[PDB]
Design a protein around this ligand. Structure first.
Ligand code: NA
Ligand code: NA
Ligand SMILES: [Zn+2]
Length: 248
């Protein structure tokens, strides 16, 4: 019952019932003119000051949450790419917040990088607050996907022609590399944004995942998490499960 564990539990419990959007940031494999663009083909470290700061935050979040009791054989390239994506995802969120003149302190958010059985790397984002309403969900997904596709094309480490960069930009938008949780529906029928409950989804779902410690990653595992209160960031897997236990 460290102060960090108690602090995270309390912070989540206070936001147990806060409605938030659920997004997933992802990428998909692309081949353009024989050039293979895979999930980890975005390893340029762009020298924008904010992005650099965000990437350092991801690195230190990884470092502090690492359990050194056990060995970790995650590929260095994999870690690098995840740190970079953490910075890019958050840049996208912050760019849209700026568009709406939303003070970052008025926002609750949670980010978790995972490796899915079929899709591989992806990043869950829960985000909401007083300046948010359900009807804005579609707009948010579209805007986030604009910035996500823009940054991915900038960060891509594969040498691309201008025509190929534009094609890749189009693919990331048209194939919705940012998804929004909606209620189940029919292909023809309307899709309604499905808000989730912030604290509950974190404690009862995201904090139950198993930590990736190998390459290839364990199916369904998580790499790295963070939140707007820096509450879950530094927690080791064992501590995260304690938070779930105390939250109940
Ligand atoms: Na970068
Ligand atoms: Na994170
Ligand atoms: Zn996932």
């Amino acid at each position: 019952y460290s102060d960090e564990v108690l602090g995270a539990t309390n912070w989540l419990k206070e936001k147990s019932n806060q409605e938030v959007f659920s997004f997933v940031f992802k990428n998909e494999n692309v081949q353009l003119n024989g050039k293979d663009i895979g999930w980890n083909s975005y390893k340029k470290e762009l020298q924008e000051d904010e992005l650099k700061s965000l990437q350092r935050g991801a690195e230190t979040t990884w470092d502090q949450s690492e359990d050194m009791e056990w060995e970790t054989t995650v590929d260095e390239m994999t870690k690098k790419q995840v740190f970079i994506f953490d910075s890019l995802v958050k840049k996208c969120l912050f760019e849209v917040l700026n568009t709406k003149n939303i003070f970052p302190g008025d926002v609750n958010w949670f980010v978790q990088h995972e490796w899915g059985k079929d899709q591989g790397w992806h990043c869950h984002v829960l985000i909401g607050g007083k300046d948010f309403s359900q009807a804005q969900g579609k707009w948010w997904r579209r805007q986030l996907n604009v910035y996500w596709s823009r940054w991915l094309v900038t960060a891509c480490n594969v040498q691309l022609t201008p025509a190929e960069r534009i094609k890749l930009r189009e693919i990331a938008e048209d194939n919705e590399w940012v998804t929004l949780l909606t209620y189940k529906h029919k292909q023809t029928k309307k899709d309604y944004t499905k808000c989730v409950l912030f604290g509950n989804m974190i404690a009862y779902y995201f904090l139950t995942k198993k930590k990736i410690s190998t390459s290839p990653p364990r199916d369904g595992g998580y790499f790295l998490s963070s939140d707007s209160g820096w509450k879950t960031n530094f927690l080791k897997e064992g501590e995260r499960h304690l938070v779930s236990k105390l939250y109940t």
